[PDB]
Ligand binder design. Structure first.
Ligand SMILES: O=C(O)CNC(=O)C(=O)O
Ligand SMILES: [Mg+2]
Ligand code: NI
Ligand SMILES: [Zn+2]
Length: 331
């Protein structure tokens, strides 16, 4: 078996290999990339997402989210407090202010130490889940707004047409902005392009060891676990690498820089933080290999998680038994 230690693999496709997205994902998995839960794809030098980022300041962040932490340095939850709308221009200025700016540091490792030491004592503001795209319409390769839809994949594989659409989201980040431990909705894949700015550091657990993370999570967030059998679907729980090591949870870490893609694989738990002002674009996608993961995916039915319109159909077709109880959590 390829990549038996579940290392995060880095790919350097040629511009020829960059034409066919599906085929390259399949290629990565033939080399065992999926065993890590996460991969890095460096685009060919010929490729550009768009000409410049000089004209993005007028994008509105309708609902910036202030990420307030509770708990201990290495084991904490976060909640999102809604703040007033601001433009990307205003957000960038806020990100660079003394209160919110990245501190002096030697290297990514030093910044990572500072993140886990001090994250809980601040509440950075995140522009997350903003519907939209920064890919030029003429960017033909790996354009996150032009991927085959999950609905079309489900139909190709299972013979059934379903409602739903699948569009990208933009994330404007600053120092310490944080994404909690999670898999994707319906344990889908995700792909994330870091368009501009400062890096994003990621942690990931191999899909074959996901349940180990879940078991640790139930022990570390015992109240949350009693409230919901899939409370990580709430995307609020953080566990540091030091704590994962102490508990023998297998994982890996890697820093994504501007101009690089990351792909998360089905049931690959991940979490991470941003190093300073940045902009990423992301979207879920599916392959034939996803179907079995979709069929087995845990669901939140306590009602916290509350998800996209499009997910109804996935649960309805793939998890008909769960569909009655799940949709009650949606309404
Ligand atoms: O960029 C972020 O904050 C979160 N992104 C993801 O979890 C993803 O792309 O799968
Ligand atoms: Mg603009
Ligand atoms: Ni994700
Ligand atoms: Zn729940």
């Amino acid at each position: 078996a390829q990549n038996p230690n579940c290392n995060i693999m880095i790919f350097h496709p040629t511009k020829e290999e960059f034409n066919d997205f599906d085929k390259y994902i399949a290629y990565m998995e033939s080399q065992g990339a999926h065993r890590a839960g996460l991969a890095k794809i460096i685009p060919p030098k010929e490729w550009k997402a768009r000409e410049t980022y000089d004209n993005i300041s007028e994008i509105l962040i309708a609902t910036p989210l202030q990420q307030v932490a509770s708990g201990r340095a290495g084991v904490f939850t976060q909640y999102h407090k809604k703040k007033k709308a601001m433009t990307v221009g205003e957000y960038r200025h806020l990100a660079n202010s003394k209160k919110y700016q990245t501190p002096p540091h030697q290297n990514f490792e030093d910044l990572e130490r500072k993140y886990w030491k001090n994250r809980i004592y601040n509440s950075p503001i995140y522009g997350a889940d903003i519907s939209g795209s920064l890919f030029d319409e003429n960017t033909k390769q790996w354009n996150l707004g032009h991927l085959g839809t999950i609905q079309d994949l489900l139909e190709k594989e299972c013979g059934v047409v379903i409602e739903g659409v699948n569009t990208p989201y933009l994330y404007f980040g600053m120092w310490k902005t944080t994404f909690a431990w999670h898999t994707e909705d319906m344990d889908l894949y995700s792909i994330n392009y870091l368009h501009l700015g400062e890096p994003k550091t990621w942690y990931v657990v191999p899909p074959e060891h996901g349940q180990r993370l879940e078991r640790l999570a139930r022990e570390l967030f015992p109240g949350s676990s009693r409230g919901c059998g899939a409370f990580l679907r709430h995307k609020v729980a953080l566990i540091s690498p030091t704590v994962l090591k102490e508990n023998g949870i297998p994982f890996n870490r890697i820093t994504q820089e501007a101009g690089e893609f990351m792909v998360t694989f089905p049931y690959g738990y991940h979490a991470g933080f941003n190093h300073g002002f940045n902009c990423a674009e992301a979207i879920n996608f599916a392959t034939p290999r996803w179907i079995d993961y979709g069929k087995m995916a845990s669901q939140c039915s306590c009602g916290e998680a509350r998800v996209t319109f499009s997910m109804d159909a996935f649960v309805r077709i793939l998890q008909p038994e769960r569909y009655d109880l799940w949709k009650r959590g949606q309404d």
